[PDB]
Structure formats: C-alpha cells, structure tokens
Amino acid sequence: FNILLATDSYKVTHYKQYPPNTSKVYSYFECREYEETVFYGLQYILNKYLKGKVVTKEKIQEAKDVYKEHFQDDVFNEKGWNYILEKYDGHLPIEIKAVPEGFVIPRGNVLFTVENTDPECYWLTNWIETILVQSWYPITVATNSREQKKILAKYLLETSGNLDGLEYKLHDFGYRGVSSQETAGIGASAHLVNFKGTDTVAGLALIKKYYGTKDPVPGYSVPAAEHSTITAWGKDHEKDAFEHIVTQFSSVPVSVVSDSYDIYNACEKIWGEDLRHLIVSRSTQAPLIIRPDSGNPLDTVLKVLEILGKKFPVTENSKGYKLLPPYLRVIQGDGVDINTLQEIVEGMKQKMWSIENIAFGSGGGLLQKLTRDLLNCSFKCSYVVTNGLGINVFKDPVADPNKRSKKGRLSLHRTPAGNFVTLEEGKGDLEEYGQDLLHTVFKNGKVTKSYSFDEIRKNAQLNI
Amino acid sequence: FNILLATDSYKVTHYKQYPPNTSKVYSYFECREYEETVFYGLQYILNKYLKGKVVTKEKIQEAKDVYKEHFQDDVFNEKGWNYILEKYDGHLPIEIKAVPEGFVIPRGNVLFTVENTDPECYWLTNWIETILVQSWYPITVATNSREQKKILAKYLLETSGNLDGLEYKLHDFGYRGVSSQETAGIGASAHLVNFKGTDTVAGLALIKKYYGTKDPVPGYSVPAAEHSTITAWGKDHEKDAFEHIVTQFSSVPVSVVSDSYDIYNACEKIWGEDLRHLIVSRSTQAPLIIRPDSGNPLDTVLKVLEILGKKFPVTENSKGYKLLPPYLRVIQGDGVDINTLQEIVEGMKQKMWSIENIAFGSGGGLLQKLTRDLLNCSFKCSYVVTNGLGINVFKDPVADPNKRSKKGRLSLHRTPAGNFVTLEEGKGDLEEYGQDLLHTVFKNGKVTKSYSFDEIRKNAQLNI
Ligand SMILES: O=C(NCCCc1ccccc1)c1ccc(NC(=O)n2cc3ccccc3c2)cc1
Ligand SMILES: O=C(NCCCc1ccccc1)c1ccc(NC(=O)n2cc3ccccc3c2)cc1
C-alpha cells in the first residue's frame, strides 16, 4: 500500500491551488441533514493506512513515475512528500479528533476533524480526504444494521414480552454479494457492532486485529445447507438429503434450505410427515431451522408458518402469539433488507405469529445495497490560516441549501437537555457548553486513543 | 490472506452433507436471464487468491482454532485440507474453464465452470464459490459502464457525426464513494475496460500487476479544483481563486468547480465577464472545463450552457448542433448514473446542444450503486458423480421459475447465426456446434491462460 497513490488524482494538483501563504487547512466529517448514525470504522483506517512510516524514498519515486504518465505532466509534489520523509521519518504531521467509536449521534454533527500540525503540510489535510471519507461505509453498515435491530426489538418485545435472542435475529449472509474481500471484512465487522450472527468469516480477523474482544470471537454461525448439498442427491432424493443432514447435525442447530423444488411440499410432506420423527426428537439447543429462499418473502414466510403450525404442536405464549415447538424454527434469508424485514415482522404480528419463531439472513441488503448518499457522509474544509490570519471557510450552493457546509473551528457538545450540538466559528472556546466531546485519536503518525470492540458495542446499544 | 477463512461459514460444514461416495462436484457461473454482460475480473481473483501454495500447516491450524470458537464445535475438515497440503503442496486440485476476458455475452449463458480434479476434493468446488462469486462486481461495473458508453456513443454520433473523444466522456470520480480500497482498484479497473478517464488511482496498479497494457498507464486525469481549493480563498475572493487556478494550469486542461456559492453568477459574471480574457486566450488542447456540482443535473447543465452560449462565441456544427468554442467545456460530476446520463444527453439534444460540449464524472453511480441482483450473477452446482455415476443436478423453485438452474456438464458455443448458446447435459460432446468457447484458465494451482488488458478492451469494444 502506497498512501501517495491512495487519493483522487485531482488532489495531486491541489497544493498549487490553495491561496499563497496558507499554513493551516482544517476539515471535518459529518453525515449531513436515519436520524442518528453509529460512528464506527475510523480506528481501522488509522491503523491500517495512516499510522507509522507511511512515506519512503521508494513510494515517492513510484508515485512520481505513475503521476508523470497519468497526467502526461510533472504536477506531483515531490518536494512536499520528501519534506515529510526527511523531517518526520515518513510520519504524517496530521492531528485527527473524533467522537468515540460506537457513539450514536444525530445527523448534521461533526464526527471527526483533520488538520495539519506543520505549516509546510497545509496540503496534507485534504490529500487524505479520500481514504477517510471511506469511513462512510462502516458507519452506514453499522447504522442500517442498528436500525434493523430497532425494528426487530420492537416486534420481538411486542410478540414475546422480552428481547431474548435479539442479537442472533439478523444474520450476515453477505460475503458473496459484496464488491471485495476487504469490503467483506469491514462490512461484516460493522454488522457485528449490533449482532452476533455472521457467516462472513473475514469480519472476525478484522475485529481481533484492530479492535479486540474479551470473548475469543465477536460472531457465531451454525451448520447450514446450501442448494448444492441438497440438489447433489438428485431431484427424487430430497428426503434422503434432508435425513442425512439432520442426522449428521443431530446434536447442534442446523439450517436446511427447503425450496430447491417445492418449499410447501418439503414443509408439509417431507419435514411434516416423512421426517417428522427426526425433528420432534431434537433438543431445544439444537433446533431444525427451516430455510425458504425464493418467492415473495412475506407470503412465503406466512405460508411456511401456517403449514408448520398444522403439522407440529403450536403453543400460545403469554402475549397471545403462536409459537412453534422449541426444536423447530424458520430463517428467511432471501430478499431481506430494512424494508422487507419490517413488512415481514408486521405481517407475522397481524397473523399472531411470534417473532421468536424467525431469524433473518441478509446479504446484499445488509452489506452491499448502500451508498454514501444514504447518510450524506461528507468531508469539507471549514477553517484555514493564510498570512497568519484564520478565516471561516464554507460552501453554500445556490441550488442546494442541504449542501451548505459548517464554518470555522468545530466542537461537539452536550446540550443542557443531554442532546448533542456542534458549535461553529470556534464558539466552543467560550466555556458556555462545557467540554468538547471529540478526542485526539491521531497525532503525528501515532494513534493516541483507541477503543475495544466491547466499548463500541456498549456505546451502540439501543435505549430499549 | 487465508483461503480457509475466505468462505461463507456454513461451507465449512458442507463436506458432511454431500451424498456419500461423491467423487466430482461441477458448478457454473452465469448472469441469469442489461441484455449482455462484459466478462471481466476472474483473472485478478485467480492470481491474488487461488494460485500457488494457498494451504500451509499454519493456515490449517489458524482456521481450526477460529472455527472451534465460531461454531462452538469442531466442524472443520482438517483431514481434507491436510490432504491438499500433503498431496499437492497446498495447490488447489481445481479446474476452472472460462469465456475469454472482455467477452460480451448475452444473459443466461455459462461464463465459467469449476470442478475438482481429485475425487477426494469433491467439497472444494463449492468452498471457493464465495471468492469466485465476487467476480459479480467487476462484471457489473464493466457492463454498466459499457451500457453508458452505448448511450454516449449514440448521442455523440447523432449530434456531432463522429465518436471523437468518446473514451474520455465518462470519468471515474468514485474513489471516496466506494466501500474500500480494494473495491476502488477492482471497480476503477472495470470502468477502464470501456473508458480512459479516471481519478481512482488504485485501478492503475491493479491493471499493471494483473493484466498489463502496452501503454505506460491505462487511464488519465486532468488537474481539477475541489470546493476546498476555491472556498479557502474566502467567500469574497472566488474570482481570485479562479484566476489563480487557470493561471497555474494555463497550458493544460483544467476543471474548475464553480458552484461553491452561485454557479449561474460564476458562469455569467466571473468566467463570462471578469475572467473572460483568460479563457478566450486558452489553447484547444488546454480548455477550461466548467464544473457544476449541485442542483437538478439536467436543469443545471442546460442553464449553464445557455449562460455560456450568451457570453462566448458559439458555432453550429455540420449536424445543426451548437458548439462552445474549443477552449471551453463542461463536466457534470454530481448525481450521474446510467438514468441521469440518458436524461442529460436527451435534454441537450432537444435544446440543440452537441454532446461534444460535455463530459460526465460519475462516483457512486459508477462504482458503488450496484448489487449482485442487477445481472443476477449466480454460482450453482449442475453436475455430480456419485458411485461412479454422473447425474445432472439443478434447483427449480416452485415460486420462482427465474431461479431455475442449468443441468449437467455445460459448454458455450457459437450458433449458425453467430450468436451464443449454452449446451446443457454434456450435449456439447456431440460435435453439432463448433468448439466450446470456454478455455481452461486455472488447473491444479496454476493460471493456464491469461489476457492482457489490451485484449480485454478489444473484446469489449462496441459494434458502432
Ligand atoms: O436461525 C438462525 N439463527 C438464530 C437462531 C438459532 C438457534 C436457535 C435456538 C437454539 C440454537 C440456535 C440461523 C439460521 C440459519 C443460519 N445460516 C444459514 O441458513 N446460512 C448461512 C448462509 C450464508 C450465506 C448464504 C446462505 C446461507 C445459509 C444461521 C443462523
Ligand atoms: O472533461 C474532462 N475530460 C474529458 C475532456 C477533457 C479535454 C477536452 C479537450 C482537450 C483536452 C482535454 C474532465 C473534467 C474533469 C475532470 N476531473 C474533475 O473535475 N475532478 C476529478 C474528481 C475526482 C473526485 C471528485 C471530484 C472530481 C473533480 C477530469 C476530466
């Protein structure tokens, strides 16, 4: 990895565009205008990409040669980068202040700030904008996943009277559906801020290396079938596949995809009749989890529950909701996103089915179908020092008032009612709102403040 | 990187679920039936993750320890992995056959096939499904980018009579808007299959290392301003920022973001009057590229052109379309996706403005706002050998006929009309069509067939 080649190309030309005699460039990150966001992911970026000796003679030379051909010109600031290498032994003279990881902050508040610590490195602040703006992705995955936890908590509390097993109700199925291996690890780790169920193995090593947990692993999985392990038995031997799989995993929970040919027939005749004796004998700690994987997600879930409820002994819980026996559960792992999750739990509640009966598996909806536009994550310059005089800087486009940026030195404070407020124009210097809630997390190539994954989970907890 | 930890967790349990005495598991990838797809990206995956000694004693031990905690059970095929390490020195006994990279294939056709070459490694075929299915991402970026090239080619030919500069009309602005650094490189490389303009530097090193070009670089950029380089001058000094930037880049093309405060005022009064003398003196090889960055993308583009057309000498080309002078161009780099690109070029054509006047910059729309659902990229088992007898396997869900998978051994052929056909059930073995268009690209840990980035671009060319 070469930080000199980890920026948008046009940033290579910006050192020539700032007003002459600029000694300071101060910039901030916010999720402009999903009313609250989970701040997570910055620590990964600081450790993997920004800390220590990030500049070498070889990296300067590599970047010089690439930019010469990429621009068909020599616009690359070799002098500026050589200065960092000679003066600071390749350590970035940058200071980053951030809100603690796991923090749940309303939209339109400063989340982190970046500024150069050496007047010669005024151009460095916005050079690293590209790498830091990528924090949008673990922030959005964590926020969207927590918003799904809120829906699940509401319906589970309503239909069961408690939140037992909440942290296992939304399972990450997204490994194949993401754009890369690196995205998988980052995305799966952000989902693990709110839940404990994951199949995206990549997320576990990321948490271990960059955050750390008291427990040996932050996430868990159960054995489960795929279409290939059922279909390989042949069209006429689906019962044999099912029987073999539940016998191989007789003492542990097992998920079995049952829609290869006909989900309703598999539920009513195979599980419901032919193999029913192998299901009713299972332990409460080792249920059979039936998995539909096609059709309308809500209509399929309701029909599968109606079928199972007629083949198996259904009880009525203390809230008046139907509950499958403890050796039998369902997982809907096709077409699950925040909108369909909501339609399914509401549809289940209307048909008097307890949310304790179901878990959700989400792939693309959880980790891929997200953009920087969802929370409007933006990095903007708000303060500059030119000729020793500080000026409050901002954009305010005529056709888009929502794109107006904050002015001057920023500070995050607790209001008297215990809410959050961002103070602009260095007004935080007046001691009217107490202490700034951002902490120096990076200074001159060193990570100065870190959070464990346990702290992050605690900060990201629901009020509920 | 550890391939034993680069799969969906549940795949760790599948070796126990296949029918006993299974010696072969044969699977294929297709974009289930954007009528045609660009096949690109597999070569990157084969080289970075699948080739050479991918199994070591340390990797087996690491995976064993992780899976023990992840499952709270010892469900990990240590014996199977130890077999690969001892017999093949950690090289995968897999054979991958694929359509050549850059190939443009209609939906619902086999693109690549995977099968184990050793009977003991029947479970390996679908173990690597997760890593190979991630090919969906460079395939979708390449396909969506080529579809935008088709729209641009149609409107540029209609309004100018040629395709000059077509390869520079859609610029990659997506670095900050993607989920990770790795995604950035893969995504920007897939856009470079169709275009030459990129700011996502990461894509250049990926092409150089995995594909290679005769040219020193596959992509180019121009100097350009950002809001920070303009706003840093102060709200009252936007004209000074503009003047400084165009003077610093007087001899090369320069893009200048002009919507910081009021895009229409910047076009009419700053560029159109105060700085007009610095613009009209510019070379044809060094235009000023005005960049709006907010508002309704089409309304803003049309209003900017109407303003500029009244301040600068406009000509009418041989097709009857208005053309700005050669030292002045526009780039729309906000809210550009395949749908808005289409609305803008159609709206320009309706107002008699040539497409030679404009270029597009696309960020999230180009590299992030894509999912595996767009082309329905899917990996499925189609053939198995159990007890020495081959059987044609497939899924066919009752509620979703579109999810039906192909049966048996597959081959891709040219039809008599020169189209593509996928033959099922080993019917390709009858010599009724020509040669199978799938070639072995990977066999027993070695990459057996490679394509240069030059070949890929030629294969992905538009008919026009
Ligand atoms: O229901 C589940 N968890 C919570 C309840 C479990 C429980 C209840 C009571 C006692 C003990 C345990 C559950 C079900 C299925 C799965 N996994 C699958 O069905 N997979 C993994 C996939 C990954 C990618 C693509 C497809 C996949 C299919 C995981 C967890
Ligand atoms: O119009 C362009 N290229 C094709 C025509 C150029 C031409 C015509 C005639 C003769 C010589 C050359 C062009 C314009 C802007 C840009 N770049 C920007 O505006 N940037 C890069 C960004 C990256 C991230 C975020 C924001 C960005 C802003 C690049 C190329």
CA distance A120 to A108: 31
**Contact in structure between B99 and B36 (CB atoms under 8 Å):** no
Q: Do B147 and B128 fall within a single domain?
A: no
Q: Is some CB atom of chain B closer than 8 A to the CB atom of A311? A: no
Same domain, B125 and B159: no
Contacts of A9 in chain B (CB under 8 A): 198-201, 221
Q: What single letter denotes the amino acid at residue B165?
A: G
- C-beta atoms of B223 and A181 within 8 A: no
Beta B170-172 vs B358-362: how paired, if at all?
parallel
Nearest CA to ligand 2 atom 12: B253
Name the strand (E) or helix (H) holding B106.
strand B104-106
**Chain position carrying tokens 């992780």:** B66
- Which chain A positions have a beta carbon within 8 Å of B13's beta carbon? 223-224, 249
Checking DSSP bridges between strand B36-38 and strand B104-106, what pairing results, if any? Answer: antiparallel
Alpha-carbon span B215 to A69, nearest angstrom:
9
Burial of A328 (0-12, 13-18, 19+ CB in 10 A): buried
Query: Using CA atoms, how far apart are residues B381 and B17, in angstroms rounded to an integer?
Result: 14
Residue B196 dihedral angles phi and psi, to the nearest 5°? -115, -5
DSSP letters spanning B236-283: GGHHHHHHHHHHHTSSS-EEEE--SS-HHHIIIIIIIIITHHHHTTS-
Residue B430: both structure tokens together: 């009858």
Distance (Å, rounded) from C-alpha B6 to C-alpha A202? 7
SS3 A253: coil
Q: Which residues line ligand 2 (CB under 6 A)?
A: A 8, 10; B 168, 171, 173, 197, 199, 221-222, 224, 253, 255, 285, 287, 289, 291, 329, 331, 333, 359, 361
> Which residues fall within 8 angstroms of residue A398, CB to CB, at 6 or more apart?
B259, B261, B262, B263, B264, B265, B295
Q: Is residue B274 domain-shared with residue B342, that is, in the same domain?
A: yes
Which residues are CB-contacts of B283 (< 8 A; sequence separation ≥ 6)? B251, B327
Residue A211 domain boundaries? 134-371+451-464
Give the determination technique: X-ray
Q: Shortest Cα distance from A30 to chain B (angstroms)?
A: 14
| CA–centroid distance, residue B281 to ligand 2 (Å) | 20
Contacts of B184 by beta carbon, 8 Å cutoff, 6+ apart: B174, B175, B178, B200, B202, B203, B367
Q: Map tokens 């910006």 to a residue.
A: A14
Beta bridge partners of A331: A359
CA of B255 to the centre of ligand 2 (A): 6
Q: Which two tokens stand for residue A39?
A: 């701040």
Q: Which chain A residues in 317-376 lie under 8 Å from chain B, judged by CB atoms?
A: 363-364, 368-373
Structure-block tokens of residue A170: 């939304």
Q: Output the six-digit token pair for B341.
A: 């690109």
Judge if B191 and B207 occupy the same domain. Answer: yes
Using DSSP, state whether B446 is helix, strand or coil.
strand
**Do A199 and A342 share a structural domain?**
yes
Distance, in Å, from the CA atom of B128 to the CA atom of B114, rounded to the nearest integer, reads 9
Say how far residue B423 (Cα) sits from the centre of its chain. 27
SS3 of A392-443: ECCCCCCCCHHHCCCCCCCEEEECCCCCEEEECCCHHHCHHHCCCCCEEEEE
Closest C-alpha to B345, from B145, B152, B171, B146: B152
- Residue A444 and residue A435 in contact, taking contact as beta carbons nearer than 8 Å: no
- CB of A310 within 8 A of CB of A273? no
Resolution (A): 1.9
Q: What 8-state DSSP symbol labels residue B378?
A: E
Rounded-to-integer distance, Cα A330 and Cα A407, Å: 52
Cα distances from A257 to residues A293, B11, B352, in angstroms, run 7, 13, 57
**Residue located nearest, by CA, to atom 2 of ligand 1:** A359
Handedness of CA A301, A306, A310, A313 (dihedral sign): positive
Query: How do strand A110-116 and strand A94-98 relate by DSSP bridges?
Result: antiparallel
Q: What single DSSP character describes residue A100?
A: P
Specify the pairing of strand A439-443 against strand A94-98. Answer: antiparallel
SS3 assignment, position B128: coil
C-beta atoms of A8 and B173 within 8 A: yes
Which residue of B289, B323, B334, B344 sits with most ligand 2 atoms within 8 Å of its CB, as the best mutation to test the pocket? Answer: B289
| Nearest CA distance, A214 vs chain B (angstrom) | 13
For chain A, helix (H) and strand (E) counts, in that order, are 16, 18
Give the span between the Cα atoms of B233 and A149, in whole angstroms: 46
DSSP state of B409: S
Helix (H) or strand (E) holding B392: strand B389-392
B297 and B233 part of one domain: yes
Question: Would you give the end-to-end CA distance of chain A in angstroms?
Answer: 43
Least Cα distance to A366 among A149, A172, A225 occurs for: A172
CATH of the domain at A250: 3.20.20.70
User: Looking at beta carbons, which residues of chain B come within 8 Å of A1?
Assistant: 181
> What's the CA gap between B11 and B67, in Å, rounded?
11
Q: Which chain A residues are within 8 Å of B374, Cβ to Cβ?
A: none
CA-to-CA dists, residue A272 to A239, A306, A364, angstroms: 11, 12, 32
Pairing of strands B446-447, B439-443: antiparallel
Alpha carbons B105 and B202: distance in angstroms, whole number: 27
Backbone φ and ψ of B439, nearest 5° = -120, 150
Which regions of A276-398 does DSSP assign to beta strands (E)? 288-291, 315-316, 322-323, 328-332, 358-362, 377-386, 389-392
Report H helices in B108-194.
Answer: 124-127, 129-133, 136-160, 181-191
Q: Are residues A291 and A156 in the same domain?
A: yes
Residues 243-282 of B with CB under 8 A from A: 244-245, 248-249, 252, 255, 259-265
What angle do helix axes B136-160 and B181-191 make, rounded to 10 degrees? 40
3-state secondary structure of A274: helix
Do A106 and A198 belong together in one domain? Answer: no
Q: Are A148 and A34 in contact (CB under 8 A)?
A: no
Chain A residue numbers touching B364 (CB-CB < 8 A): 371-373
Q: Which of B46, B62, B128, B179 to mutate to test the interface with A (most CBs of A within 10 A)?
A: B179
Collect all residues with Cβ–Cβ distance below 8 Å to A340 and sequence separation of at least 6.
A297, A298, A365
Residues in contact with B219: Cβ distance below 8 Å, sequence separation at least 6, in sequence order: A70, B172, B188, B192, B195, B196, B197, B198, B203, B204
Overall number of domains in chain A: 2
Strands (E), A273-376: 288-291, 315-316, 322-323, 328-332, 358-362
Q: Give the largest CA-CA distance in chain A.
A: 84
What is the DSSP pairing of strand B110-116 with strand B94-98?
A: antiparallel
CA-closest candidate to residue B361, choices B271, B257, B281: B257
Query: H or E segment at A301?
Result: helix A297-311
Between CA A157 and CA A62 the distance in angstroms is: 58
Which ligand is nearest the CA of A178, by number? Answer: 1
Distance CA A47, CA A96 (A): 13
Would you call B346 helix, strand, or coil by DSSP?
Answer: helix
User: Residue B423: what residue type?
Assistant: L
CB contact under 8 A, B17 and A241: yes
Distance CA B459, CA A407 (A): 51
How far is C-alpha A259 from the chain's CA centre? 30
Nearest Cα to Cα of residue A352 among A295, A302, A292:
A302
Residues 6+ apart with CB under 8 A from B61: none
Ligand 1 binding site (Cβ under 6 Å of any ligand atom): A 168, 171, 173, 197, 199, 221-222, 224, 253, 255, 285, 287, 289, 291, 329, 331, 333, 359, 361; B 8, 10
Beta carbons within 8 Å of B100's beta carbon, 6+ residues apart: B39, B437, B439, B451, B455, B459
Q: Which two tokens stand for residue B309?
A: 């057309």
Collapse the DSSP code of B344 into the 3-class scheme (helix H, G, I; strand E, B; otherwise coil) and give the result: helix
Determine the residue of chain B that is closest to A392 in CA distance: B234
Q: Phi and psi dihedrals of B429, rounded to 5?
A: -65, -30
Instruction: Enumerate the β-bridge partners of residue A187.
Output: none
Residue A430, C-beta contacts closer than 8 angstroms, at least 6 positions apart? none
Which amino acid is present at A39? F
Rounding to the nearest 10 degrees, give the CA dihedral for residues B16, B17, B20, B25.
-110
Using CA atoms, how far apart are residues B334 and B188, in angstroms rounded to an integer? 18
- Lateral strand order in the sheet of B288-291: B170-172, B358-362, B328-332, B288-291, B254-257
Q: Taking Cα atoms as reference points, which of B172, B182, B198 lies closest to residue A70?
A: B198
Q: In terms of CA atoms, which chain B residue is nearest residue A187?
A: B179
Host H or E run for residue B461: none
Under 8 Å CB-to-CB from B152, ≥6 apart: which residues?
Answer: B166, B169, B170, B341, B345, B355, B360
Same domain, A10 and A38: yes
3-class SS of residue A166: helix
One domain for residues B99 and B19? yes
DSSP B270-316: IIIIITHHHHTTS-TTS-EEEE--SS-HHHHHHHHHHHHHHHS--EE
DSSP state of B434: S
d(CA A288, CA A361): 16
Name the token pair of B439: 């070639």
Query: What whole-number distance in Å separates Cα of residue A266 and Cα of residue A237?
Result: 12
Nearest ligand atom owner, CA of B259: 2
A294 and A322 co-located in one domain = yes
Burial class (CB in 10 A: 0-12, 13-18, 19+), A372: buried
Alpha-carbon distance B358 to B255, whole Å?
12
A130 closest CB neighbour out of B49, B176, B255: B176
Sole residue written with tokens 């080619």: B153
Q: Which residues are CB-contacts of A159 (< 8 A; sequence separation ≥ 6)?
A: A317, A319, A321, A348, A349, A353, A354, A355, A356
d(CA B433, CA B415): 7
Residues A358 and A390 in one domain: no
